[PDB]
């Protein structure tokens, strides 16, 4: 009978809610009431990268924190040199509807995907010297939303058919599949030790996955609308999400509940991207009002504004050593802030 | 030593990007949208994953995309098509049961935040079936739309066919002109299953849209 199963499911949901309520005793805001404010964080544009014809959806930094890759809707991948603004490479793509890009940890490969439902891997260091397609990973049903390189051989991708997958680039078959989401999976974030990852969906839900065991461990709720971005804390025991209700929230894996929310009355536009600084003290979030705000993670008080873009901010990333932050936008211009 | 090689590579990439810029600015992009019942596939085949179609009229290149490999929920991937010249909307006017679904989809597209600057070209397809159904006087329209009982025409078979055609067109135009910022319009056309003027109609409508954009840009509007 379906009715008894539904009653049992809601009974377990009530039990989980009661356990979470009992496990909470204090709030993070009151614990951090005795620390000093960060102050006014003023950042200036140090570089402006020009050359993209159309709007930008994705970018990714390199491990050396010098070269980065950006994807655009005219159908081009460009590898930059943020020190001198020289275009190292320019890769023309087969499909112009590209929604994501990735940079290999070893720096030999890049990947991209979009409405074509196919993820393609490019070899930047071929023996001849040119850039050619190395593999085309097919098997997803919806559009590709995000992809991340575990290492030179394994890549994890999320699609719009409410599933994630783990690929083997050498052979091209799906090693593992992750299921359980109800809406489109919009973003994923790998753990610092690359043993777990999270994923946000259009169901206002986030889940924690085990790469080896291949099952969902925990599920976190609290948002009221679709989730657009997600990012791990530097120590690997927390993450932050950005949604369409114009709020961000910080979740803790061990406590298995929300810790703090970052919102203001004057903001009515959703968040398109989030990121953390090197030490985790500052949280940077992009908004639909053409601005990016800098938050105080331990205080939930705004501390800075970046106002250099004339259109929607789509992507935002911070280098490994935290020397700079790069933000792309829908007006086809990248900017390095410091 | 490496600076000279880096500069030479940058210059080569800039030249290639300039050529690509010229080629990209040359052409125009369109989005073909509709339902399964509507004969949009037949339309795109008449002037013939994502089904691209390139046609050229008066030495001007047009590009049309018909995405069909996705799921039912389209509120997230629809934001990739906010820079197109126009949206082609195809409606099967002979099916009264699913006309309100078309009206709701049109309202959702018209009132979107990122699609509030894109003009829509409306095609009211399947005219012969509508004429046959109206003449055969078996399935009535008044019971689906009770407002049809107090409507007067503002075709050759009878005035009733004209009345029905313009009633449906007026429904769509009322939704269009209800809420608007005078930044985008709607161009309704009456097309049948077999016609050869769709390319010319698209050319004229796109020319009007572009001219209006240029007038606004040059402060004349």
């Amino acid at each position, epitope marked *: 009978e379906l009715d008894q199963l539904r009653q049992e499911a809601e009974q377990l949901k009530n039990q989980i809610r009661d356990a979470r309520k009992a496990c909470a005793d204090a709030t993070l805001s009151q614990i951090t009431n005795n620390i000093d404010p960060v102050g006014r964080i003023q950042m200036r544009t140090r570089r402006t990268l020009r050359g993209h014809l159309a709007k930008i959806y994705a970018m990714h930094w390199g491990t050396d924190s010098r070269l980065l890759v950006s994807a655009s809707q005219d159908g081009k991948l460009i590898i930059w040199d943020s020190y001198t603004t020289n275009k190292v490479h320019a890769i023309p793509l087969r499909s112009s509807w590209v929604m994501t890009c990735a940079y290999a940890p070893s720096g030999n490969y890049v990947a991209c995907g979009g409405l074509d439902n196919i993820c393609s891997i490019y070899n930047l260091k071929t023996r001849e010297g040119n850039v050619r397609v190395s593999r085309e990973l097919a098997g997803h049903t919806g559009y590709l939303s995000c992809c991340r390189f575990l290492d030179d051989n394994q890549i994890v991708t999320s699609s719009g058919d409410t599933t994630c997958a783990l690929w083997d680039i050498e052979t091209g078959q799906q090693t593992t599949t992750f299921t359980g989401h109800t809406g489109d999976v919009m973003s994923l974030s790998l753990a610092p030790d690359t043993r777990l990852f999270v994923s946000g969906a259009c169901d206002a839900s986030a889940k924690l996955w085990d790469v080896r065991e291949g099952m969902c461990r925990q599920t976190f709720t609290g948002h*009221e609308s679709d989730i657009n971005a997600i990012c791990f804390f530097p120590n690997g025991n927390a993450f932050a999400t950005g949604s369409d*209700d114009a709020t961000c929230r910080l979740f803790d894996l061990r406590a298995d509940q929300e810790l703090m929310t970052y919102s203001h009355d004057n903001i009515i536009c959703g968040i398109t991207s989030v990121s953390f600084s090197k030490s985790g003290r500052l949280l940077l979030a992009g908004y639909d009002d053409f601005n990016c705000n800098v938050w105080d993670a331990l205080k939930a008080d705004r501390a800075g504004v970046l106002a250099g873009h004339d259109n929607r901010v789509s992507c935002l990333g911070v280098t490994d050593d935290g020397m700079a932050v790069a933000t792309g936008s829908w007006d086809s211009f990248l900017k390095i802030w410091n | 030593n490496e600076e000279k090689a880096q500069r030479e590579a940058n210059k080569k990439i800039e030249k290639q990007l300039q050529k690509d810029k010229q080629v990209y600015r040359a052409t125009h992009r369109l989005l073909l949208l509709g339902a399964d019942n509507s004969g949009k596939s037949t339309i795109v085949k008449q002037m013939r994953g994502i089904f691209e179609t390139k046609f050229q009229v008066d030495k001007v290149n047009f590009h049309m995309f018909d995405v069909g490999g996705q799921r039912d929920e389209r509120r997230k991937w629809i934001q990739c098509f906010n820079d197109v010249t126009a949206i082609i909307f195809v409606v099967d006017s002979s099916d009264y049961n699913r006309l309100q679904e078309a009206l709701n989809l049109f309202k959702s597209i018209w009132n979107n935040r990122w699609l509030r600057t894109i003009s829509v070209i409306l095609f009211l397809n399947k005219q012969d079936l509508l004429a046959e159904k109206v003449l055969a006087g078996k399935s009535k329209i008044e019971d689906y739309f009770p407002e049809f009982a107090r409507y007067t025409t503002p075709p050759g078979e009878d005035p009733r066919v004209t009345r029905a055609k313009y009633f449906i067109r007026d429904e769509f135009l009322r939704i269009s002109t209800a809420s608007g910022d005078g930044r985008h319009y709607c161009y309704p056309h009456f097309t049948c299953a077999v016609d050869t003027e769709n390319a010319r109609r698209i050319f004229n409508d796109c020319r009007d849209i572009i001219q209006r954009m240029h007038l606004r840009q040059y402060e004349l509007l």
Partner: nanobody
Amino acid sequence: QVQLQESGGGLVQPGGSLRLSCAASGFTFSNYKMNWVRQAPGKGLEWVSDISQSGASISYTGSVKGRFTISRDNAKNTLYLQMNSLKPEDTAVYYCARCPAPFTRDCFDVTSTTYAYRGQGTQVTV
């Protein structure tokens, strides 16, 4: 999480009356546009009515005009549908849908097969 529970179904003779109520929780009710959706047996999801954020604008489908009335109570976070002069073609399961995003006036995908912010449904038979 978003929770929408509907109640009010039952057996009604033709020409009778019936009232449907939906209790909403887990989100701010006053920032969202609410819908009523029904699904007849052997037929897909069909839109019925919607009401604005404050109830200023009300619209219905063609076949229910003059018989159905939709209202919302922001004070207690409830939605209502007042059925009148029921017909044998009105038998279906009634779902209450929600606008995906706040402060907007467009509603994508409320009638989809796997919409997330939709209720379990109640059975109405005449």
